[PDB]
Structures are given as C-alpha cells and as structure tokens.
C-alpha cells in the first residue's frame, strides 16, 4: 500500500539474574503496524539470535517527515535476495518525503527488477544535502538553473462517446 515509517524497539524477555536486556531499535517501512512488527522480528532473528517467542516489543511509533513540503534528493541503498547472494544496489530518488521515495523504489523494483516487497531489503535512505553529490543523470537533469520544459501532445479526456469537433493536442 502507501507506506509509513515506524520505529520498533524490542528486547529479550528478562530472566533470572539478567534484568534490563539490551533494547534494539529498527526503522521499518510498512503499510501498517502488524506488518512492521513482523518485519522487525524477521530482521532481529536474521541478524541476532532472538526469537519472537523469547522476546517482546517494547515500543512502536510512527515517524513523520520533518519537512514534507521540501523537495529533496535521496540516496537509497538496498539489497535483494538472490541465488548468487546479497546484491547491493544504489539508486537516487527525488521526492518530498522518505515514504514517497520508498514507495517509488518498491514500484521501480517491481517494474524493472521484477522484485517483491518480501525480497527487497532497505539498508539506508539518506538525504543528499549538497547537489554536487548527486551522481545519476536522470536526477541531475532536473537540477538545472531556471528549468523550463513543455508538455507536447496534450490528450484531453472525453466524457462523451461522440465529439462534434476534431480534437487538438495543443498546449
């Protein structure tokens, strides 16, 4: 669906002589909190030796974009599950929000790489402060000063089956 970002903080169950186990936080992109918690347990078991049965979720909070009406460039570092192994991929996405950039990235992985949400891992989404660190041409072409472009061949949606006039594509 449309993505939200959550911080999920969990821990092992306290035992005898071991109070206050270490708290682990993870940033998860998901459609809702049930999916977010599921992905968190998946990664915690994949990385450490912690199971959902032996642990608990301490906190889960939605994280909002700080400046959702500011256009930013994002470097996205991902890796996808494969027979040859984990494969790094770096992409650049221009958008106003991290969740919008991640939604674009998932749609793009489905379109080009034929990849699914369960197969894609997000390693890091970072905002590029300076425009000189942008290094993909399909993003750098939109960083030109006084950028103006037209939209040739305008196709207007018709509400009726028949039109009494030949259409125009002018804009």
């Amino acid at each position: 669906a449309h993505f939200k970002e959550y911080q999920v903080i969990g821990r092992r169950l306290p035992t005898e002589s071991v109070p206050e186990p270490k708290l682990f936080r993870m940033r998860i992109f998901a459609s809702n909190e049930v999916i977010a918690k599921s992905r968190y347990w998946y990664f915690l078991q994949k990385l450490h030796k912690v199971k959902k049965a032996s642990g608990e979720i301490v906190s889960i909070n939605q994280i909002n974009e700080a400046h959702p009406t500011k256009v930013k460039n994002f470097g996205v570092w991902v890796r996808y599950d494969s027979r040859s192994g984990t494969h790094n991929m770096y992409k650049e996405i221009r958008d106003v929000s991290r969740v919008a950039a991640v939604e674009t990235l998932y749609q793009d992985m489905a379109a080009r790489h034929r990849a699914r949400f369960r197969s894609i891992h997000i390693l890091k989404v970072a905002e590029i402060e300076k425009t000189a660190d942008v290094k993909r041409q399909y993003v750098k072409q939109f960083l030109t000063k006084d950028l103006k472009f037209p939209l040739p061949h305008r196709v207007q949606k018709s509400t009726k089956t028949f039109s009494y006039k030949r259409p125009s594509t002018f804009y």
Binding site: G75, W77, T86, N88, M89
Partner: protein, 72 residues
C-alpha cells in the same frame, strides 16, 4: 509473398497436464540431488553511495568501542 502456417497458441489440456506431471517429477529429482550432492558451500558499501566515509568512520568507531566493551 507466400505466407506459411502459424503454430497454434491455443492451450492443449493433455499437454498442460503432462507439463504439470513433468514439473513435479523435475522438482522431486532436484530435491533428491540436492540432498545427495557433495559441493562446498557481504558485498559491502556501494561505490556510488555518497556517505561512504561516514559509514566507514562509524563502523571503525563501533569496532574500537566494541573492542573494550567486552573486556571491561
């Protein structure tokens, strides 16, 4: 300009069901060969990631901290 015969793409029931049996046999054979065979069993930071230096500095500081975390 003589046009030849084109192969039909209409599905055949017998072929479809036979391919189903073929695929099940193939998967079972592959699983058996996987349980039988004797063949021995971290790409890191991408070169185009801009904050490579920050990632490396953080991993080095983490290593230095973890070196003394377990000792004391």
């Amino acid at each position: 300009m003589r046009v030849r015969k084109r192969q039909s793409r209409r599905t055949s029931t017998k072929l479809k069901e036979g391919i189903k049996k073929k695929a099940s046999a193939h998967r079972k054979k592959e699983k058996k060969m996987a349980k039988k065979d004797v063949t021995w069993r971290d790409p890191g930071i991408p070169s185009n990631f801009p904050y490579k230096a920050k990632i490396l500095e953080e991993i080095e500081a983490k290593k230095m901290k973890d070196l003394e975390e377990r000792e004391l």
